[PDB]
Amino acid sequence: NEIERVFVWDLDETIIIFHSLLTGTFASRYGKDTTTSVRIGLMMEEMIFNLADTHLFFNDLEDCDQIHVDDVSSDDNGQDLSTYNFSADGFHSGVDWMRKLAFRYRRVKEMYNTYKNNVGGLIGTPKRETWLQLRAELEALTDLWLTHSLKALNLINSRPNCVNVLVTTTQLIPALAKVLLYGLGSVFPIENIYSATKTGKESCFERIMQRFGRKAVYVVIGDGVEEEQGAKKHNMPFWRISCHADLEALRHALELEYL
Ligand SMILES: O=C(N/N=C/c1ccc(Sc2ncccn2)o1)c1cccc(Oc2ccccc2)c1
């Protein structure tokens, strides 16, 4: 490719897998209301899984959790599937089976590239007003974290020589449902999302470097410890993102071309 610097992101523990909300440990650490925080997380995890079951084949692709969306691109005899009836094919729970599985991921990809900047047309209103109301309800507890990290991502996405990728441990379909909904679709191309569920984040890191080559600068930006050791044993500069002030430094270091 033409990319010079690649930023690998691990937005779990804060955005994708925000398990601190549901356990209530987030509310205790930051001194917020426990009951309200869990209610926002329980509503969120519902509207996410409700979209994956009615749009992204969550029940079909529940166990067949791949790692990249283009993995089964070899069994795809590319066809106009605007008429392909998924409810009446040989799918259940396999060269003729992998083709039906591969079509579904391309249909998932079609939904991503189509409604990633127009969610209100994907989930018809008022499901947007109620759900955009949910953002301010949560960003009022996290001090606009998703908005803040979107600034650091758009400060990278607009650079033609720089790019960003995402490496989470959720299954690919639920992770795509969150990235689509949460608004991270404008900064994350769907071809740059990896699911470290069965393989771990280290193997997902090696898979990224093999794609972009050695002439590029790889930087890891995330929170937690799983990707810190995965970025250390691959000599990739790790960027902690725990505090809110650690993000202001990430922007200020990109404003001045220090990265
Ligand atoms: O903001 C978000 N997480 N923040 C997490 C976090 C942990 C530590 C800190 S820093 C801090 N500073 C001061 C006080 C508290 N914490 O932030 C978030 C996560 C997911 C989705 C999300 O948006 C939406 C949008 C639409 C619908 C539903 C959610 C927003």
Task: Supply the number of helical segments.
Answer: 11
What is the number of strand segments? 5
Number of domains: 1
The hetero compounds bound to this protein are: the ligand O=C(N/N=C/c1ccc(Sc2ncccn2)o1)c1cccc(Oc2ccccc2)c1
Query: Largest sheet, order of strands side by side?
Result: 3-2-1-4-5
Distance between the termini: 20 Å
What's the overall geometry? globular
Percent helix: 40-55%
Radius of gyration: 19 Å
PDB class: transcription
Keywords: eya2, eyes absent protein, phosphatase, transcription coactivator, transcription
Assembly: monomeric
Entry title: Structure-activity relationship studies of allosteric inhibitors of EYA2 tyrosine phosphatase
Task: Give the tags.
259 residues, alpha/beta, 11 helices, 5 strands, globular, binds the ligand O=C(N/N=C/c1ccc(Sc2ncccn2)o1)c1cccc(Oc2ccccc2)c1, Protein phosphatase EYA2
